From a paper:
GLTP binds the entire ligand at the protein surface, with the hydrophobic tunnel remaining closed and containing extraneous hydrocarbon for apo-GLTP. The sugar headgroup of n-hexyl-β-d-glucoside binds the GLTP recognition center in a manner similar to all GSL-GLTP complexes reported previously and in this paper. In apo-GLTP and the n-hexyl-β-d-glucoside–GLTP complex, the tunnel has collapsed, although the bottom (represented by cylinder 2) remains occupied by an extraneous hydrocarbon. A disruption of the H7/H29 stacking is observed in all apo-GLTP structures in which the H7 residue is resolved, including in our D48V apo-GLTP, as well as in our n-hexosyl glucoside–GLTP complex. In contrast, on n-hexyl-β-d-glucoside acquisition, there is only limited outwards movement of the α helix 2 N-terminal segment and adjacent loop L12, but no movement of the α helix 2 along its axis nor outward movement of α helix 6, keeping phenylalanine F148 in a swung-in position and allowing for only partial opening of the hydrophobic channel, in a fashion similar to that observed recently in GM3-His6-tagged bovine GLTP complex. Comparison of the apo-GLTP and the n-hexyl-β-d-glucoside–GLTP complex provides clear evidence that the recognition and anchoring of the sugar head triggers conformational rearrangements of the gate region, L12 loop.
Mammalian glycolipid transfer proteins (GLTPs) are potential regulators of cell processes mediated by GSLs and display a unique architecture among lipid binding/transfer proteins.
Residue numbers in the entry: 5 to 209
């Protein structure tokens, strides 16, 4: 399974190449939601992955780790850093990754609206509220909240995730949990790197 992330090494330095390779399998899974109304969250994650790749691909040795990108871009472009280039793209990407995490985890934990137990709208909304909303002005909130309102049925979403293979609903859930392990750990380290490096900005778009 190629969306599975590597374990963290002991020094916690995330290698850019394998990271980019693994998360770039995430955007296509937005199609499992069904609707093309979710293209805003999908396209955003995607675009940020591409911008980080654009920098990385110019010089994989120098941009070997995620930390390298931040330190090097600070050297190249001190006045505007961290509001620059791949540093900024990763700043936004982590929030989108956290959104996905907290969404999936909430599903696995079995949180639900008792009034609408086969939807995943509460899961999406809680994910958006904790990960992204505080960084979005009203117009972008309008866009993201319209789309969450097309959240599919839980059973459909899970059936869709496990297409091509023969796997029960709680086998599919077991697979989500497994993915969440190194995925969650990596996200935590990215957030922590942003705080440690004074790279975190809180403006709204
Ligand atoms: C898919 C449309 C939703 C817009 C969300 C916003 O975030 C963007 O904001 C910054 C500009 O400050 C870009 O650098 C990011 O790449 C992007 O996610
Ligand atoms: C929000 C859509 C992203 C889903 C990612 C799930 C991948 C891991 C489970 C197979
Ligand atoms: C089918 C088109 C939906 C477009 C939303 C950006």
């Amino acid at each position: 399974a190629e969306h599975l992330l590597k374990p963290l090494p002991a020094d916690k330095q995330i290698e850019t190449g394998p990271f980019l390779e693994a998360v770039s399998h995430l955007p296509p899974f937005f199609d499992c939601l069904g609707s093309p109304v979710f293209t805003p969250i999908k396209a955003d994650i995607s675009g940020n992955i591409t911008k980080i790749k654009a920098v990385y691909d110019t010089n994989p040795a120098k941009f070997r780790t995620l930390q390298n990108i931040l330190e090097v871009e600070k050297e190249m472009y001190g006045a505007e850093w961290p509001k620059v280039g791949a540093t900024l793209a990763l700043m936004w990407l982590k929030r989108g990754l956290r959104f996905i995490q907290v969404f999936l985890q909430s599903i696995c934990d079995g949180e639900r609206d008792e009034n609408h137990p086969n939807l995943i709208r509460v899961n999406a909304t809680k994910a958006y509220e904790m990960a992204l909303k505080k960084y979005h002005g009203w117009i972008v909130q309008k866009i993201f909240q319209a789309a969450l309102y097309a959240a599919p049925y839980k059973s459909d979403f899970l059936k869709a995730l496990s297409k091509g293979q023969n796997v029960t609903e709680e086998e599919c859930l077991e697979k989500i949990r497994l993915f969440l392990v190194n995925y969650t750990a990596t996200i935590d380290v990215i957030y922590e790197m942003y705080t440690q490096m004074n790279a975190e900005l809180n403006y709204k778009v």
